[PDB]
Amino acid sequence: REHWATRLGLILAMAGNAVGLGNFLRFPVQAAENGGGAFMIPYIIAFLLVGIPLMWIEWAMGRYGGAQGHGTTPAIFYLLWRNRFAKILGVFGLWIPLVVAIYYVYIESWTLGFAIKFLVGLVPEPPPTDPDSILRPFKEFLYSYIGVPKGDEPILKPSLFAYIVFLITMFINVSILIRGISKGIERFAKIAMPTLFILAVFLVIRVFLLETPNGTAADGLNFLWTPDFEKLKDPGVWIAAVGQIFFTLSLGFGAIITYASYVRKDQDIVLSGLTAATLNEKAEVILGGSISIPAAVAFFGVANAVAIAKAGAFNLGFITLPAIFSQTAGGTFLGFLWFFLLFFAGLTSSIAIMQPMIAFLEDELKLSRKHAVLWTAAIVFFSAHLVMFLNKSLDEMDFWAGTIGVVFFGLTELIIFFWIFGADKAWEEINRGGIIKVPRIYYYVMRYITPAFLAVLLVVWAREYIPKIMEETHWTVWITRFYIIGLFLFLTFLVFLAERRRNHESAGT
Amino acid sequence: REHWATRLGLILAMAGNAVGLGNFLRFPVQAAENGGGAFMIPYIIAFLLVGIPLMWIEWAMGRYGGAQGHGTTPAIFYLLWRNRFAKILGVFGLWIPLVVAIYYVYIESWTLGFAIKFLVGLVPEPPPTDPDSILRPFKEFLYSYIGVPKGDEPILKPSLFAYIVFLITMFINVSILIRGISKGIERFAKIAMPTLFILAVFLVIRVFLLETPNGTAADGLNFLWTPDFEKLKDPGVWIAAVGQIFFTLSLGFGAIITYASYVRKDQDIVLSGLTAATLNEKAEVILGGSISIPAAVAFFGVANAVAIAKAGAFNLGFITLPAIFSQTAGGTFLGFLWFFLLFFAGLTSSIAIMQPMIAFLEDELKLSRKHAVLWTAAIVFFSAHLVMFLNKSLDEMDFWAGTIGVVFFGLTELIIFFWIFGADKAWEEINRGGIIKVPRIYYYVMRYITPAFLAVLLVVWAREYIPKIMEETHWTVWITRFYIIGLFLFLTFLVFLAERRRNHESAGT
Ligand SMILES: CCCCCCCCO[C@@H]1O[C@H](CO)[C@@H](O)[C@H](O)[C@H]1O
Ligand SMILES: CCCCCCCCO[C@@H]1O[C@H](CO)[C@@H](O)[C@H](O)[C@H]1O
Ligand SMILES: CCCCCCCCO[C@@H]1O[C@H](CO)[C@@H](O)[C@H](O)[C@H]1O
Ligand SMILES: CCCCCCCCO[C@@H]1O[C@H](CO)[C@@H](O)[C@H](O)[C@H]1O
Ligand SMILES: CCCCCCCCO[C@@H]1O[C@H](CO)[C@@H](O)[C@H](O)[C@H]1O
Numbered sequence A, B: 001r002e003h004w005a006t007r008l009g010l011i012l013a014m015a016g017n018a019v020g021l022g023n024f025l026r027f028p029v030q031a032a033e034n035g036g037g038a039f040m041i042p043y044i045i046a047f048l049l050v051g052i053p054l055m056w057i058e059w060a061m062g063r064y065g066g067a068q069g070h071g072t073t074p075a076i077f078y079l080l081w082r083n084r085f086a087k088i089l090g091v092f093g094l095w096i097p098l099v100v101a102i103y104y105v106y107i108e109s110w111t112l113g114f115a116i117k118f119l120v121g122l123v124p125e126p127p128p129t130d131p132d133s134i135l136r137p138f139k140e141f142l143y144s145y146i147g148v149p150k151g152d153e154p155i156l157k158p159s160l161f162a163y164i165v166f167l168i169t170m171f172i173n174v175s176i177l178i179r180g181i182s183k184g185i186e187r188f189a190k191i192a193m194p195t196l197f198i199l200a201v202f203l204v205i206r207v208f209l210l211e212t213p214n215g216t217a218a219d220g221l222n223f224l225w226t227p228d229f230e231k232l233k234d235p236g237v238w239i240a241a242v243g244q245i246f247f248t249l250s251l252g253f254g255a256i257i258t259y260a261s262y263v264r265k266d267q268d269i270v271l272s273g274l275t276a277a278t279l280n281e282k283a284e285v286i287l288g289g290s291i292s293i294p295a296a297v298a299f300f301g302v303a304n305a306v307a308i309a310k311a312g313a314f315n316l317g318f319i320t321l322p323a324i325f326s327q328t329a330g331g332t333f334l335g336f337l338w339f340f341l342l343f344f345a346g347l348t349s350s351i352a353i354m355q356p357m358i359a360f361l362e363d364e365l366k367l368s369r370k371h372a373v374l375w376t377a378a379i380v381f382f383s384a385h386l387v388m389f390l391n392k393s394l395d396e397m398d399f400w401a402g403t404i405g406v407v408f409f410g411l412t413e414l415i416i417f418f419w420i421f422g423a424d425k426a427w428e429e430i431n432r433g434g435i436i437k438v439p440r441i442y443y444y445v446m447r448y449i450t451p452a453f454l455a456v457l458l459v460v461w462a463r464e465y466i467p468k469i470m471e472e473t474h475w476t477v478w479i480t481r482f483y484i485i486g487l488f489l490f491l492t493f494l495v496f497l498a499e500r501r502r503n504h505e506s507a508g509t
């Protein structure tokens, strides 16, 4: 079995897994919608009670499974819990990352397409001036790229350029993954993360120089970092914060687990895990947090920036920021650096969420890496056509897998590892080989606090928010639900085939 | 490997494979739309130049493959042509029957649901009287059952009863298939075919007693059996006739092939094949032809009957016939016998088109029969939800697999067997063990006439009819196209897994 070559490569790869579109696109919108500073208190608490503990748990499960030649949850869950039901629940650790990949790589492809067009200056030119005469050209630019419906039919019509760029993005993901863990993902991480970090710091600096009659970047910062103890009572904020914590750390994706399955049995996961998690948080609250919001607030003021963020999920990153930049010297090139940053942030994440499927085909069905990577790419590529052509399909997939799914799976994996497998066996398994030990307090956090935290969260989520969303949707949501349910059935069938092959090889030898 | 126990069981099973909804629902509509007697000339010629020759070819390929432990075309095509491309083209022999099964079993489920409701007298009661005040109650009856859209959304809403009946139908298919070839399909065939034949003859007789001021059943017969040599110049009729010949004989479904793979290597296929084919033709032109049309013409006259048939595909069988019967003494029970006939005609066919998938999982992936049957049922059941809830999804699947697909595959299998494998090897392979030999003339028919016939047909089909259908469809057709293309990808992946398992077991031993 492959292993990470160096500890640095391991850290940077795990950091690249975590640090992605979530830091630069998702986090700003989440924080903005939920009151900025008001969002941060629950966010910080979530990182301490959920983010950190689950990270260690997933590193441990991965290293544990890897030692026995298994990198994905269908098998790993079965190792911790000898029950057929464990294999079925383990399917989510293939399904979630696959479904997420199906829309994530497409969004990643947009960042590359924009980077290219901004580089070559093939971008809209606003009139040299109300705020809308400047934004509109950029809205139309995005709308033409992805092909937003101009009529009543829920159908998207992406440009030829967007389509070809998606193919190129898939090709780029494949070229890295096909070279494996050490020579592929690890090598690229060593190049991608430093580059990523530099671009971000530069962008932060540039943004900090923004000033208009409407305000400064500093106004944005104070909005994000001013505690609002009155919102800490609203369940919606807590749900938003925990959801972002999950998505941001790649928890519940089965991705941290699969990566960790390439960590040597004895190699530390305590300090490495904590480091990777801390790296992500810095990139998120310091880098991601200091770019979009402050730029928006500088040009529009707090109130307007919040409305923009609430307007859409891609408004701030694909429309508003480039529009703002176009009003500054060298702004088109600054737009390029922004989208190039997003692309590298996307790329190092998409390889992470596709690897679980790759590891499964290799580990359980004994496919060569080449075949495992190509077939995986083929499923993601084909499935992505639903996201490219059906309006809101992306939203539906992001909800069931990337929102509900990850939290459900986080709770599931904790229960299995800390409750069923044994709290003391899990605790010892996490600390084994540790350069440092986990503080004793975290034993009771993991065993009692985290699970109770997630369970209550899911319930309150279930009672007050899921009924509204389920009942009010357009009928086309069922197309996506139907398809991704079929995907789960498909993966269940593969796990079944894997156990058959296993039983045959066992009797044969 | 399983084999058919008796020659009678073999014949009746193959006859049951062929004789189905096609004889009693499809044929009447096809003949009616295309001028009745005008349709028959091309139909007869198609049976002689396509039906018969391809039947022998598929029996031969099946027996040939079975002798080596292979019942489906991915492997069988590879035996006749050692090329990776043969395995890929062979996927259609799994895909076509699977896609057809996905809508066929659902339609079959309607016949059972209607049979039940007609038996218990839970049917509409027309006013004791314009023709429309009688038909309408029965249209609404069907429309409520399957849930025809009442608004603008292309969404179906089948009744709870219809849904539960589909589950029961799947269960019934499974209960037969799970017992295998001899104890399952063969046993049931021996019971189903005689019953089927008796019900049909009775219905024909009852129908022949129908008379109204508008005419008699005899008027219908003369319309069907009066040659119209002026339509024999219209390509559309030829296309209709050949399509019906294919669907009717189950050619291009990979179903005849899989059944024949259970015929012993030495056992005759010439006389058996011809007998099975002739049995079907009798059930079609004599039985199927003498029920719906004559009944419709008796009550409405020729002109009206043709318009009714053109109106829809299920109008004649699910609305018009029961409506007509309701005007006769014991008509509700006659309706029951009609739908019971359709159900048994459906059932013996659906087990035939699901067996190829079953044989593949058994033959190539080494699944037990139980698992192969259950997983197959699960794919068909799940996939059928598209056909149950998306308006016109059924039409789309029937077109690509059941119409275009079967003809394309018929030509493909002939080329592979008679051209690539060797015309003389194929000829000798067909005649081997024959109780009778194929007339020498059919060698040149198979080698030159049939292929040229199908090729020209497909071309004329392609130039004049496919562009219209492709261009004019509602956008929702892409949902079905997307799904069934994914199904093809899925089956291709299984064939890939099968070749890997094969290569591993070969090296292991
Ligand atoms: C392998 C699965 C193929 C499914 C059908 C894919 C059809 C893609 O079609 C392509 O879409 C692009 C984006 O709109 C267009 O710009 C191109 O002109 C068009 O050819
Ligand atoms: C680095 C990847 C570059 C991809 C270049 C894609 C070029 C798209 O091609 C262009 O598409 C336009 C819209 O359909 C057409 O108007 C142009 O004629 C055509 O050249
Ligand atoms: C809710 C989670 C908060 C984690 C903060 C942990 C800070 C470390 O806390 C320290 O842990 C050591 C080892 O257990 C002890 O020896 C120290 O007494 C304790 O202060
Ligand atoms: C395993 C795949 C499940 C996909 C969702 C299936 C939902 C079926 O839902 C059922 O449909 C019937 C027909 O309209 C209704 O009569 C029932 O009330 C309804 O529960
Ligand atoms: C042989 C199989 C019998 C299946 C019986 C299905 C009975 C359907 O059940 C009925 O459905 C109706 C419509 O939703 C409701 O109005 C009735 O209350 C309910 O009993």
Ligand SMILES: CCCCCCCCO[C@@H]1O[C@H](CO)[C@@H](O)[C@H](O)[C@H]1O
Binding pocket: B048, B049, B438, B439, B440, B441, B445
């Ligand atoms: C177009 C297909 C028509 C098939 C009709 C075949 C009728 C049998 O034809 C007979 O075949 C025998 C064996 O080859 C010959 O000995 C006879 O001379 C010939 O008349």
Ligand code: NA
Binding pocket: A018, A019, A020, A021, A022, A023, A247, A248, A249, A250, A280, A284
């Ligand atoms: Na992140």
Ligand code: NA
Binding pocket: A016, A017, A018, A019, A020, A021, A344, A345, A346, A347, A348, A349, A350
């Ligand atoms: Na990344």
Ligand code: NA
Binding pocket: B018, B019, B020, B021, B022, B023, B247, B248, B249, B250, B280, B284
């Ligand atoms: Na038939």
Ligand code: NA
Binding pocket: B016, B017, B018, B019, B020, B021, B344, B345, B346, B347, B348, B349, B350
């Ligand atoms: Na049948």
